[PDB]
Antibody, heavy 211, light 218 residues
């Protein structure tokens, strides 16, 4: 069964370039990209048997499509990276149809550099349901994981997709609804992890007082 | 160049419905008796998978309840008995002329009864404020349908350009959405105003719901 294994996620500063590997097991090799939450955009194709390549005009003379035949590996090289190039990138085998897709490779392109998050509580107020959470703020790059009570409490949790702030750092909220009747008998800790900065934090969350 | 547009962008169906998405092209996509159009299915956080090729042919392991018709400039995808596994975003892609372009996508999502949100406002933590920034957070919990507006108001002046939102994927158990919105002020500007308000308009709500707090009475 046909499989295309791409290289891992990349974080690259503007004006720099990136090379994505695509390894085949089991025709044309296309490269497509998708910005998060956006529709897809075709970059180019290459026929491994003659090295014949064609490219989308948008990527004239930034894209380089190659193959190492003896290692069954396609490569996508993109030069002079800019903000607008942050995307998931997929190699695709074309049947001529694009029938087999890789898993994709997130490329992040930002002048920003690694920063751990600040985690601030969202404390409930007062009514029979209680909303509490954690604001995981000003970190770079994605992702952060967020759990509650070490994964004991999973029901009612909404962890939201991060937003990219004007500062160029990310920030997301994770909230959970719980019975009001439990906030005096049961403790709520959000466990926030950011691997790219080796930031692990546990933040207990309780309603606030002085009324 | 060649540009495809899908209709509708969003479609709400229940299991067992018959559903039709339309791909319209700016040029004819036929050449040499070949219809040069492909259909994809994408789920959040996965690569696309090909459903249909040459407009009407099923891809490997694609069940027969998926089919496609069309010629020239207009193409359709039909799902005859919606199965739970079919709520997805679907793309059309043209293969005749090279840019190989895609359409914008059509999200197929689960229909259910209207559900008003639960609204909660969160004032900024003391810890954050000493750093110099206030984030006020507004939560809309477990509502349907997806369409919702959050208006920030500070001393009953509605805010523009200082909030960001994100929404969760449709919940697999209860088929509702949730929304988190963040209002970002400087410590300095936050301290000049008394009333921080989150106003939420939604089809489930006879009239907008406001959640607010008064700074320094918290």
């Amino acid at each position: 069964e046909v499989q295309l294994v791409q290289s891992g996620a990349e974080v690259k500063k503007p004006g720099s370039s990136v090379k994505v590997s695509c390894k085949a097991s089991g025709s044309n090799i296309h490269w497509v990209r998708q910005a998060p939450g956006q529709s897809l955009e075709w970059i180019g194709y290459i026929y491994p048997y003659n090295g014949g390549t064609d490219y989308n005009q948008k990527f004239k003379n930034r894209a380089t499509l190659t193959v190492d035949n003896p290692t069954n590996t396609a490569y996508m090289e993109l030069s002079s990276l800019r903000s607008e190039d942050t995307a998931f990138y997929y190699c695709v085998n074309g049947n001529p149809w694009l029938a087999y897709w890789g898993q994709g490779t997130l490329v992040t392109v930002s002048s920003a550099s690694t920063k751990g998050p600040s985690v601030f509580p969202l404390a409930p107020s007062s009514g029979g349901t209680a909303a509490l959470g954690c604001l995981v703020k000003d970190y770079f790059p994605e992702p952060v994981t967020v759990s509650w009570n070490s994964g004991a409490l999973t029901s009612g949790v909404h962890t939201f997709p991060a937003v990219l702030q004007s500062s160029g750092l990310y920030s997301l909220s994770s909230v959970v609804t719980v019975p009001s009747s439990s906030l005096g008998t049961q403790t709520y800790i959000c466990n926030v992890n950011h691997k790219p900065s080796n930031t692990k934090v546990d933040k207990k969350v309780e309603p606030k007082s002085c009324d | 160049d060649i540009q495809l547009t899908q209709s509708p962008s969003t479609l709400s169906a229940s299991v067992g419905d018959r559903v039709t998405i339309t791909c319209r092209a700016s040029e004819s996509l036929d050449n040499y008796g070949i219809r040069f159009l492909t259909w994809f299915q994408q789920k959040p956080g996965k690569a696309p998978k090909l459903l249909m090729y040459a407009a009407s042919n099923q891809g490997s392991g694609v069940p027969s309840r998926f089919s496609g018709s069309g010629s020239g400039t207009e193409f359709t995808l039909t799902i005859s008995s919606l199965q739970p596994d079919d709520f997805a975003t679907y793309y059309c892609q043209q293969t005749k002329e090279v840019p190989w372009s895609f359409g914008q996508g059509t999200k197929v999502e689960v229909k259910r009864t209207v559900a008003a949100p639960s609204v909660f406002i969160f004032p900024p933590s003391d810890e954050q404020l000493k750093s110099g920034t206030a984030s006020v957070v507004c939560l809309l919990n477990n509502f349907y349908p997806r369409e919702a507006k959050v208006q920030w108001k500070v001393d009953n002046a509605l805010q523009s350009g200082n909030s960001q939102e994100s929404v969760t994927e449709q919940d697999s158990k209860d088929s509702t959405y949730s929304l988190s919105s963040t209002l970002t002020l400087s410590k300095a500007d936050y301290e000049k105003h008394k009333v921080y308000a989150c106003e939420v308009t939604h089809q489930g709500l006879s009239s907008p719901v406001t959640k607010s707090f008064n700074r320094g009475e918290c």
